[PDB]
Amino acid sequence: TSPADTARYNRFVADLFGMMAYGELSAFERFSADARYSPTLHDRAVLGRIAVVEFRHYELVSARLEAMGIDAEDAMLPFQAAVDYFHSRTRPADWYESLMKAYVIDTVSADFYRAISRYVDAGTRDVIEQIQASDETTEVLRERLRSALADDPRLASRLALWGRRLLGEALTQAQRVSYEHAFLGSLIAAAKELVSGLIAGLAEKHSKRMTQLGLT
Amino acid sequence: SPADTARYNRFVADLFGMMAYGELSAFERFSADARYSPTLHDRAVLGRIAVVEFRHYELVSARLEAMGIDAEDAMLPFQAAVDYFHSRTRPADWYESLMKAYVIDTVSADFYRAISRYVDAGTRDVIEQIQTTEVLRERLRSALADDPRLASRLALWGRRLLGEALTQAQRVSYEHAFLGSLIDSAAAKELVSGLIAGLAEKHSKRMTQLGLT
Question: Which structural domain range is residue B185 located in?
Answer without folding.
Answer: 1-213
